[PDB]
Structures are given as C-alpha cells and as structure tokens.
Design a protein around this ligand. Structure first.
Ligand SMILES: CN(CC#Cc1nc2c(N)ncnc2[nH]1)C[C@H]1O[C@@H](n2cnc3c(N)ncnc32)[C@H](O)[C@@H]1O
Ligand SMILES: CN(CC#Cc1nc2c(N)ncnc2[nH]1)C[C@H]1O[C@@H](n2cnc3c(N)ncnc32)[C@H](O)[C@@H]1O
Ligand SMILES: CN(CC#Cc1nc2c(N)ncnc2[nH]1)C[C@H]1O[C@@H](n2cnc3c(N)ncnc32)[C@H](O)[C@@H]1O
Ligand SMILES: CN(CC#Cc1nc2c(N)ncnc2[nH]1)C[C@H]1O[C@@H](n2cnc3c(N)ncnc32)[C@H](O)[C@@H]1O
Lengths: 257, 257, 257, 257
C-alpha cells in the first residue's frame, strides 16, 4: 500500500528515514505523500503532531506510527532499532484509535486537536464566561484555559494539575491557568472531565481578541464571539504491532525507564 | 409498589418522612423496609450513603431518591417543598444509573463504594506498591491513597486535587495524599483515571496493617496481602423526575446557588 | 505639608478626590504632584500601584494611602466614608514599611516591584537556568516564573500556589507557571522563599527574548543576558491611622467580609 | 569538651560511631551523654531528630552535627568519609542556628519541634477554628493541619504544597491537609507564613480529642481546649565546618546529586 515518512530533520532521523524507504523498496510498497495509507513519523512527539495535522483530512484512511530518535514519546513510542521489524510487519496488523478534540471558533472555523487546545488573552486581562451545555457555569478570570484530549492529558494538561486519562475513554478535560479566586471572581478550580456530546462554550466578557492554540499551532483570533469544545466524532488510528500499554508508557516517561 | 424512607433523625427529617408516608398511604403504595422498590433518603448526602449501603444487596431492584433537608447534596438533590409532588409521581418515571467502585481485600472480602475507598496506614508509615493491570507502576510513600467513583469525584477526591468527572463516564479516579517525592521515592503526582476492566492493585512493602475506608465505613484490616480496585459491574439506579444536570449541581454547590 | 491625590477616573473616585482636596484646603495643606509628602490613591489596588510607580523615585520621602471606591483592596484598604476623618488626621500619625523587589535586566536596567515581577517567553518555548547565589539550581521549562514581594503574595503569587507571607518578613517568593517535569526536565515545583541579600538569577538557554513584567507594566525585552532578583533595600511607607491587620485583610478578602 | 554520639543502630552507623569515639580518644575529648557540648548523629534525618529531642533541655549549650550513612539528609548532611576530618576539627569552628516551633496544648503542655507539628482528629471528622493573634480567621474542616519550621519546610510541609523557606528566616508555615471548600466551609487554601510573635491558635468546634504530632512523636490528646503555635525563642545550634548552602542541599536532594 501507499506510505510516507516524515522526519524531524536532524541527521539521525533523515538517515533512519532513508533506510526505511530502502527497506520498504524490497516489498510491494509505494511511497506517496499525497494519499498514503501509512504515515510514519521519525523524531519526537512534536514530529508526530506535525504528521497528524499534515493529513488531518484523511484520518479515516491512515494508520499512524511514531518512532522516537531521542527520548521515548507518547506517540513516537518505538525505538530506531525496531525499524527493520516495523518495515517487515507493515508490508504484510491491528489498529487502535484515540479520541480527538473539536474546536469551533465563531466570529466560523473548526480545528482538530490531538493533544489540547488553549485560550489566552491577546494582551490585556483574560475574562471569559464558561458555558456547559447552554448553561452558565462560571466567569473565569486568569491566564487561560486548556481543553485536553485523553492522550493529551500527559502533556500541557499534566503541568496544569489535570488528571491522566487512559485514551480508551472518550472524553475531554478542561484545566485552569492561574485563576483568580476571591470575594469577586469564583472558579471551580478542579479539572473538569466531559464525556462525548457535552459542549463547553467560552464567551467573551469585554475583550474579544484571544490567542488560541491547537497543538503546536497558535493564532491570534480577532472579533471572537464564541469558542466551542466537544469530543470529536473523528479519531486518529495507530498501527499496533505489540503491547505497549499506556500506563507503562506513563511509568517509563515519568517514573523511570 | 413497595417503598421505605430513611431519615437523618432530626425533627425536620422525621416530620417530612411521616408526611410522605401519609401521602403515600393515599395511593396503592406499601411501606416495606425489607424488599422495597423505592428507597427515599431524607437528610443529607450522608443519609443517602447509609441508605445505599443498607440495601447494597438489592441494587438491581431499587430506585433511590434523595431529599436534602439542609443544604443541597449531590445525591440528596431535591428540596422538601417538592416532596408532595414526589409522592404523586412515584405513585404512577425514568431511571438513571451511576457507576460504582468494587474493592477487594485479600488476606477475601469485597465492598461497593458509591463515593470512594481510601487506604491509610495502621499507625506507622504508609508504603505500598501500586500495580496497574499486573505491572508495577510506582512505590507510593505518603499519607494514603483514594480511589473515587465518578459521582464521588466531588467529595474526598475533590479536596485531594482530583478532577470532577461526569457520572455517565464509567471510570474510577485515584488520587494521592501527601506523597513524598525526592531522589528516593517517586510517584506520578497527577490523579489517574482508569476505565472499566482496569485493575489497580495495592500491595504492602513492610507493614501489612491498613486503615481501609469505603464511603463512611472505616475498618482497620490486619494481615492484608492485597487491595484490588476496579469499576464495578453493578450500578446504582436513581429515580429521575426532572432535569437537574450534574454540572448544574456542581455549579450550585461550589460556585453559588 | 505637600500632598497629591490620584484617581481611578470614574465618577465616584473623581468626586471623592475633589471633596478631599476641598477638605484639605481647610487646613495648612498644599497640593503638589511634583514633590508631595502624602500620596493618596482613590480607586482600587491598581490605582495604588500606578501611584506607587509614579513616585518610585521619592519613596523615602512619601507616605502612601489607599482608598477603595469599589471592593476592599490590600493597598486601598480604607472606605470612602472614612475620607473626612483621613483629612483631619493627615493634617496633624505613624508609618509602616513593606519590602520591595528589585529586578535587574542585563543586556542594564533596574525596576522596583510592589507586587511581583514575572518572566515569560517572547513567542516560542520558555527555558531558563535558575541560579541562586551563583550556583545552578535548576533548568526550568514551562510557561514562566513569578517573583513576589510579601504584600504581593496575595496577588499573582496566590493564584500560582504560593504561600501568603506577612509583609513584616523581608523576603521574596518565587513560584512556577506550569512547569514540565519528566525524565528530562526537573524543577523543584514548590514555591521558594528567599531572604534578604539572596540573589536569584535567570539565564537564557536558547531564546534570549522574554516578556518581562513588573506589577502592571509588561515589556518585551530583547537580547537579554540575565535577570536578577533580590529583596530591595528600598521600602514603601504607608501612613497608618488605625489597626487593620494583614491577616484580617486576608480574611476579609478571601474568606468573607 | 564533652561529647556523645547517637547511632541509627545498623552495622554501618555503629561501626562509624566506634571509630569516631576511638578518634576522639586521641584528643582531649570526654564522652558524656548526660551533659555533652557536642552531639553527633550518625544515620539519617530521623536519627538527628531523636538526638535533638533527647537533649532539647540543653539546646543553648549544645552544637549538633549530622552524619548520613544512607542518602543525604537536610540535618545529617555530612558523609562518613569526612568523619576523621570532623574529629580533628571538633577537637580544636563556627555555629549556625535554626528557628524552632513552640506548640502549647491547653486542657498545659509545651513542646519544641524541629520539623513540624500536625493536628488530626481522633477518629471522626476534624473541625477546628483557626485564630490568628486573637481574631477568628477560618473554620477549617478536613484531614488536618501542619505547622512547619523553616528547616521543616522540605519535609511534611513540602508534600502538602507548602513553600521552601531558607532557615535564616524566623518564621513558621501552616499548610492544609485536604480541606473541604464549598458553599458551607471555606478555608484560605494557600500556605500561610507567620513571623515571630504571631500566635496561631486552633480551637475545637465539637470533638475535643485530637491526634497531635511533634516531629516523630505522635500522641492522642484528650479534652483539648486549645493548641497554640508560635516561633520559639529557642534555637538549635549546628557546628559549621564548611559551606553547604541550604539551597544546594535542596538541589542535591530534589533535583539531582
Ligand atoms: C511541544 N510541542 C510538541 C509536543 C508534545 C508532547 N505531547 C505529549 C504528550 N501527549 N504526552 C507527553 N508529552 C508530550 N509532549 C507542543 C506541545 O507542547 C505542550 N506544552 C506546551 N506548553 C507546555 C507546558 N507549559 N507544559 C507542558 N507541556 C506544554 C503542549 O501539549 C503542546 O501540544
Ligand atoms: C461525610 N460523609 C458523608 C458524605 C458525603 C458527601 N458525598 C459527596 C459527594 N459525592 N459530592 C459532594 N459532596 C459530598 N459529600 C462521608 C464522606 O466524607 C467525605 N470526606 C471525608 N474526608 C473528606 C475530606 N477531607 N474532604 C472532603 N471530603 C471528605 C468522603 O467522600 C466520605 O465519603
Ligand atoms: C491587576 N493589576 C493591578 C492589581 C492588583 C492587585 N494586587 C493585589 C494584592 N497585592 N493582593 C490582592 N489582590 C491584589 N490585586 C495588576 C496585578 O494583577 C495581578 N495578576 C496578574 N495576573 C494574575 C493572575 N492570573 N491571577 C491573579 N493575579 C494576577 C498581578 O499581581 C499584577 O500585579
Ligand atoms: C520520617 N521521620 C524522620 C524524618 C525526617 C525528615 N526531615 C526532613 C527535612 N527536614 N527535610 C527533608 N527531608 C526530611 N526528612 C519523621 C518526619 O517524617 C515527615 N513526614 C511525615 N509524613 C510525611 C509525609 N506524608 N510526607 C512527607 N514527609 C512526611 C515529617 O516531617 C516528620 O517530621
């Protein structure tokens, strides 16, 4: 089938990429970066995120694979030494799917996030009303908010005090960035975990300009009327070759390897 | 059908209980506290928890209802003024189910928790190995651990920094109590959210005596070899009469009412 | 003696300012906004912060006073109804002094902060080496860092998890903003409280552009070689007329009033 | 002068203790465990804490020294290889003093803490009114409270989210253990740092039995009317032989060594 390989760009990743293309050439495998069925990322989790967004319009037809040439990643979770075994088994596997986060920006534009989407103010203070399923929940004032996917909970969400969720749970998690809490403003404080079909809506109070991020991309959006978050109906599909449990991936990354 | 009413014991709850029994008497309703189909709790969330554990052997055949005579509760979420309307509609509704936590103590004994189950040391230091699906995850040293149900996340879990999960998500959440983290002991720190069929196992390192709690009940268990946590196959069934969304219940309890 | 009054600008503050000037005119008091001995702020804590920085070059010769026309402030801690009594007693008091934070930016420029000084990245990732008294302490990667004065601990420092310090303690407190902590980057996590004469130095790793804030002012600094923090030798002097203990000010602002 | 050596009890500590006594015998040094001027602890920080409380009645006349036979401690901060050099220099140094915490239990009894003093309930719920300098600050409900010395901030205080304070600051820090915060109970949440002469008083609401700890000692106190915390007028004196800065001790223990 058709495949493509993206590289971090350094010497180690480019050389491993050319070795895998050479190995794939020994099989009935066609290199195609327009309509591939297999997308292999060689580098780090950031390289994988770029590979994800490069082909986010054909997610239903692609199985992703991440190879880490540096430290272990949560998406790039295979070592370079296993690359030849990867080529062989790719040539002849199972698939697993992770949930995604859909962000809607109304002035509308839509985006998919594999890790998270965050909102911060343009320059002045950040004040938004948080609406959950069309009911006003809180008026947040602080540095910003972060809405994370399950596989994203080990990233920005973790540094903000959020919980780590197993990626088989179809949910999204909202966490706060340095909220003010006194006799005036009151926020929930705790991270919030929302199931599928729940819609979390951010609405401006005064300033309507916001710095909105989706994974690595960050854009200053002007004249924003609303930001809608919900668990996406689309999922990202990984090629699975052996058992690397998520909790073991957490242990190896944060406890010790 | 058969019903029973439990009371907090104070004058307000006992008087409301006798008024509801009198109202139920005007219908084809039989008071029975042995095999009831309807269990009404009048008091607080603690009164509801006692009502839950009193009939935990017939959960599949009971619809629970909570009336709060004090402040709003997450289980006792109906005001005394609605009691007469409750009697009428009970006489002729829909049902909603929340997940439960199964705790297994091997020396074995099993328990169901509606809020959470916690483990603390008998007297000396608390050290346990945390095993997730038969793989060693961390060696925890600290004050204790708390495993929460979704509806329990707004209780002890919240005070420990855990996330608030909508009760439609079949999961359990583990949080830490004052863990040591230095060049010796290392814990994950973040709360962990586990899906159904995941088994979290606590195993002793030196001391084998532990103070184990399940909701309000707390027992000193001796010669403990293992404590197993998993999302229960059983669920608690609530009688539903109108929409009181969980997130609104969170807003009314923690933001303002 | 000479005095001046600054106003938030709204109708309530301007009208109270003109009433106090009229009351001061009934005494031997000279309005002077060039070399005043008394600086009265009417508005909120933000109005007071602007009054502080307007006269930061004559701190040793000025007694500050804050009047809150909205909610209680930690610097604007006197109600408008007490303004006439303030005029009388000003005309004939004691003084109390709070510590300040000195920030040095080397490319050098120096700044005084009454609340705090923060460092965030220009656009990309924020990575700095933290040096305490000329010894490397940690390599911080995250959103930013905040160094707070004692009276500033109830402001940005509090939202970041820092401790509240009584302003009689000559110290500064450093807190983290969403730090990464895994098998690569390692930060202390806890807030750090430094005494007088301790020098905390932030040094760039790759990017040398930083968004540096001092109280309300925020400047993008380019080609930064170092940022030095230390407890200032200067202090801000408040005119004291009665006992409003700091801990009571904390209770009234955060517990209830 | 007179000296004594306490040992953890294991083979390594006892053997090092006998070697130091033999080395001290080659000088005009008298072993005395009744009225020593030098108290050497060989083991861990726990061994040092026991050595501190064994001679807490002669703190003004004793210089303490800690040797760690295991991992580095904050009080036992000298390696066994330096023991012979310690004997020589002891025979002929400077002294440094750390602040202590005085706990008063009224039914009265007084205690000194080098690390911290904590309060937890006897069995039921823990509810106390927190009084700061004779003014009611908050009604705390939760697992307990911890009042830490500066050198104690790296111990229990750190695991509870408190700040790390340099031990030259004469202060005490109060932190919360899992407090309830809703529309009923309200606590400050943040750690509180109190200067000298400030008195923090814990007063019972219903239950008058409390589990009170001071460093390693923990006693169930009955019929408690009040618990008073204040920075002690006494200090612990360490023998200083070279520079091991506190912040370096923090870096070596928590960042890496
Ligand atoms: C760095 N870029 C490529 C990547 C990655 C990645 N993904 C994961 C994952 N899923 N699990 C464990 N590690 C991971 N690394 C963009 C990502 O930087 C993260 N980020 C931004 N600011 C952060 C902060 N202050 N603290 C922690 N993280 C932060 C955001 O998550 C953003 O997406
Ligand atoms: C008090 N008893 C009856 C009840 C209740 C209740 N349940 C909920 C709920 N689900 N959501 C919102 N409020 C709720 N209250 C037993 C419960 O006391 C909670 N608990 C114990 N120590 C705690 C602490 N340090 N901090 C917060 N909570 C604590 C444990 O959760 C235990 O189950
Ligand atoms: C708002 N401006 C005028 C003021 C004030 C003020 N000072 C105090 C005080 N000392 N104590 C109690 N309340 C106070 N309000 C500038 C201040 O906004 C604060 N800030 C910025 N971002 C924040 C965040 N994410 N969370 C909390 N605070 C934040 C920074 O502290 C900055 O200095
Ligand atoms: C273990 N025993 C001897 C010792 C010591 C020690 N002192 C220091 C110090 N000053 N700095 C850095 N490490 C230190 N270790 C009693 C001490 O156990 C600490 N502790 C109790 N429960 C804890 C928890 N849940 N989390 C962290 N700590 C806890 C209490 O602090 C108590 O005093």
């Amino acid at each position: 089938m058709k495949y493509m390989i993206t590289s971090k760009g350094d010497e180690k990743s480019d050389l491993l990429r050319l070795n895998m293309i050479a190995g794939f050439g020994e099989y009935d495998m066609e290199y195609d970066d327009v309509e591939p069925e297999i997308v292999i990322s060689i580098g780090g989790d950031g390289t994988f995120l770029s590979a994800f967004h490069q082909y986010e319009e054909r997610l239903d037809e692609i199985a992703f694979i991440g190879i880490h040439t540096g430290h272990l990643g949560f998406y790039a979770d295979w070592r370079p030494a296993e690359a030849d075994k990867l080529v062989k088994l790719l040539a002849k596997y199972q698939k697993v799917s992770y949930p995604l986060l859909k962000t809607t920006v109304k002035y509308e534009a839509t985006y998919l996030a594999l890790n998270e989407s965050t909102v911060k103010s343009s320059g002045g203070p950040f004040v938004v009303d948080v609406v959950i399923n069309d009911i006003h929940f809180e008026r947040f004032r602080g540095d910003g908010l972060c809405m994370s996917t399950p596989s994203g909970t080990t990233a920005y969400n973790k540094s903000l005090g959020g919980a780590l969720m197993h990626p088989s749970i179809e949910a999204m998690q909202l966490t706060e960035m340095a909220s003010i809490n006194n006799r005036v403003y009151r926020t929930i404080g705790s991270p919030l975990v929302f199931p599928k079909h729940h819609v979390v809506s951010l609405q401006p109070v005064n300033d309507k300009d916001f710095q909105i991020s989706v994974d690595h991309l960050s854009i200053l959006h002007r004249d924003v009327q609303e930001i809608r978050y919900e668990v996406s109906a689309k999922k990202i599909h990984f090629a699975r070759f052996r058992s690397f449990p998520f909790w073991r991936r957490v242990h190896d990354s944060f406890i010790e390897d």
